[PDB]
Design an enzyme around this catalytic site. Structure first.
Site, PDB file in Angstrom:
ATOM      1  N   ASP B 150       0.865  -1.162   0.000  1.00  0.00           N
ATOM      2  CA  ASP B 150       0.000   0.000   0.000  1.00  0.00           C
ATOM      3  C   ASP B 150       0.896   1.203   0.000  1.00  0.00           C
ATOM      4  O   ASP B 150       0.671   2.182  -0.737  1.00  0.00           O
ATOM      5  CB  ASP B 150      -0.891   0.100   1.256  1.00  0.00           C
ATOM      6  N   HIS B 177      -5.785  -2.968   5.193  1.00  0.00           N
ATOM      7  CA  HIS B 177      -5.154  -3.380   3.944  1.00  0.00           C
ATOM      8  C   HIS B 177      -6.112  -3.750   2.813  1.00  0.00           C
ATOM      9  O   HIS B 177      -5.764  -4.525   1.948  1.00  0.00           O
ATOM     10  CB  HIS B 177      -4.277  -4.580   4.251  1.00  0.00           C
TER      11      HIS B 177
END
Lengths: 313, 313
Positions: B150, B177
């Protein structure tokens, strides 16, 4: 930095090779080309927060765009060995693949350095040479068959035998890229070392059959991909450092040469601003290597001819 | 250096991750575990002339051997599914896999640092925590969900927007996430920067759908593997530099935390000799981020619960 294109970027070798090239600081532009899945691989790679800018190319129609303006073309392109596949049915397929891609390279970037990985290197480099010759863009300074994984394996197997860290070991490997044409010069190992006869033999056989070793370990369903990507990138990096202008960048590669009576041969080469700056000769061989050298030339010659004739028809 | 094990090393992510770990100089021993093809990947990887020594492990019966004595476990294990997903049949399958593998970790190396990647992290990290608790080996300082991809994505996309080299960009990403639980704190971007509203929104959305973007590019047949391996290794390395004793090793990760009302949350953490040395709070947020944070918390709590209940039953 430099522009790199990888032909066959979506394959087993291609993908991890693309990932490493993507991480290389000397790469400013990375072109991934394949006949399938290139967009996907490309998106994946593109998320990496590294300097290189990556673009994908799909299908023959996009080959030219991928090759244009490139400094280095890395070609792992080729098809999987199967089962069904002979070792010729394959050659026929890959020879065609190489031919096509080379025609593309001849047209779009005559001065890019080419790292040819497509199996069998022993024949495909000559195939490439013919294509370039038959197109007037042949510069033997710029065509390199990647034999680096042979060296890599050698270093690894020798270090284990010597109980050293593979990073501290260097083994020149010459001749060709397949079977007995692969000739590890154990007598020239660095650091200077002594091997027993059984070691020399085990080492030589294992280095010559490294690929088969992985194939069998993958239970026929696949051949070496990761160690190959790693070797290919180590080699590409040396080519880039040469292009950058570093002094002393030396590596073994299967190249057009006058070191032996054979037109192509793997030996140490110094990589500089225009590709190969110098093809080094074999150096002193011991008797075992001289005999090995003879076995290699014999097989290599036909392998070289299979490729030359493939095009010269 | 350190001992690292990769659970699911023969998979999409695993293989290239294994390749990179093999090249990491802090790694001295590399264990590669999977329920299929472990031997083949391992053979391939072993030819690499890098310090790490690699060994393979195949099947549940070999799991314990793979985990024993590890300093770091990296768990990308999980299935793909692709066609008839649900993300809830997947969850079922991967929750299983995570449970099993965590049980094994609980038994063989309670003090190894765990880098969990198995999707969905938002749930699997709490599943893992449950297993460790239900076995009395739960150290919240040693379980980290890898959210690095990410951050990687953020750095890359933000750099593109700012016309900078991704390497000079840093973007804290917090929360969860998956989807809207992924909260990129664009207001805290380094170097200090200004974004238009549309850029804030494009960047935020694109960072949140990164995975979906790759899945779609891959024409449903696969998801991010290379950038994932790349992100995972980057993170594993930080964990190793932490272990090594380096000062200032900070990275975002989904961890057990008291930064919010949620038990698990992603935020910058400082890595040291014992895993997490400190979980940093979110730092100043702007309004957009506070709203974002609120959306995130709502989806994340459920996801955290789906995980917990999976085990607490």
């Amino acid at each position: 930095g430099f522009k790199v294109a990888i032909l066959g970027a979506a394959g087993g070798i291609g993908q991890p090779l693309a990932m490493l090239m993507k991480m290389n600081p000397l790469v400013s532009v990375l072109h991934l080309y394949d006949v399938v899945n290139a967009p996907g691989v490309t998106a994946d790679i593109s998320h990496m927060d590294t300097g290189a800018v990556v673009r994908g190319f799909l299908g023959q129609q996009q080959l030219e765009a991928a090759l244009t303006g490139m400094d280095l073309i890395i070609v792992p392109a080729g098809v999987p060995r199967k089962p069904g596949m002979t070792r010729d049915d394959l050659f026929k397929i890959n020879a065609g693949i190489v031919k096509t891609l080379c025609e593309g390279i001849a047209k779009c970037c005559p001065r890019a350095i080419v790292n040819l990985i497509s199996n069998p290197v022993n024949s495909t480099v000559p195939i490439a040479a013919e294509v370039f010759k038959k197109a007037g863009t042949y510069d033997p300074k710029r065509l390199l068959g990647v034999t680096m994984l042979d060296v890599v394996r050698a270093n690894t197997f020798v270090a284990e035998v010597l109980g050293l860290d593979p990073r501290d070991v260097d083994v020149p490997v010459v001749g060709g890229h397949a079977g007995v044409t692969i000739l590890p010069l154990l007598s020239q190992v660095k650091p200077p070392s002594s091997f027993t006869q059984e070691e020399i033999s085990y080492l030589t056989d294992r280095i010559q059959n490294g690929g088969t070793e992985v194939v069998e370990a993958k239970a026929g369903a696949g051949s070496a991909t990761l160690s190959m990507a790693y070797a290919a990138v180590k080699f590409a990096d040396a080519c880039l450092r040469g292009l950058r202008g570093d002094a002393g960048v030396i590596e073994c590669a299967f190249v057009s040469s006058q070191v032996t009576e054979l037109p192509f041969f793997a030996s140490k080469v110094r990589l500089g601003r225009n590709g190969i700056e110098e093809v080094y000769s074999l150096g002193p061989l011991n008797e075992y290597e001289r005999i090995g050298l003879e076995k290699a030339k014999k097989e290599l010659a036909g392998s070289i001819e299979k490729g030359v004739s493939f095009i010269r028809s």
